[PDB]
């Protein structure tokens, strides 16, 4: 039932836009990229925060979309956009943070679209479980760095 | 002019919700406080980021709301709610101070906006938007990070 909640659907929509954005950022102007990222990340965080509690079934493993190749290509492309503004000391890189967030978000929405209720539920549960200490954490840390790039 | 902007209206709405939430802090538990602030802050940041370009008209200075007493009382109440959770290293900072600082800019803006004088409604908006980039915006993201850790970070640390 959870996978049918309005909050879940709204999260999927924002997640899909977030992934499509990064996947097509190639050669985008830095200022535009930073400005847009600072608008999508807060919304993604908000939508995830409003998700209902999802319980893991654990009987069927969801497919895993992101490969090392996909991760590296994306990381490299984002790094080239940010250039000398990519690094920050907390030595971390915004490009790496975004690629790590993408990994969790992309793996989730890919499976959600496959239409199998059991894996749709577990892909959501996995995404929610990883929010706290993995992608959600990187998101808030990343926003600080990006905000600094734009205004500091 | 811009004070009728669709983005301005939505910003006013979340800004008021934010100020009201902090003002009612003594009426809730820490769990509720933390969970809600992590929802209000990202929305406040997003709406501020979507505001249209504003220009200073000048003339008359907008009325101010936040006094030292208002600021101190709020800071202390927030500090009491968070307790040992208030402090975070990121230099030692306090979530309560960050929130009170953001509140100063947001509260001054919405108070004036409701007074109904077009000129100062515009100028208070311009000032708030300018200070978003100059200082409040960074305090907001820093606080979000701190609060995120308060809610999700593994406890039982040394």
UniProtKB/TrEMBL annotation, chain B:
It comes from the Bacteria. This is DUF5063 domain-containing protein. It comes from Bacteroides fragilis (strain YCH46).
